[PDB]
Amino acid sequence: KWCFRVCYRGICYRRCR
């Protein structure tokens, strides 16, 4: 249960699951 945030094309979004 851990969320991560990474920016690809300049867009940062949360990546939790």
UniProtKB/Swiss-Prot annotation:
GO cellular component: extracellular region
Location of the protein in the cell: Secreted
Alphabetical keyword list: Amidation, Antibiotic, Antimicrobial, Cleavage on pair of basic residues, Disulfide bond, Secreted, Signal
One biological process term in Gene Ontology: defense response to bacterium
Tissue spec. comment: Hemocytes.
UniProt modified residues of type Arginine amide: R17
Top-level taxonomic group: Eukaryota
Family, per entry: Belongs to the tachyplesin/polyphemusin family.
Protein name per its UniProtKB record: Tachyplesin-1
Species this protein is from: Tachypleus tridentatus
Shown residues in whole-protein numbering: 24 to 40 of 77
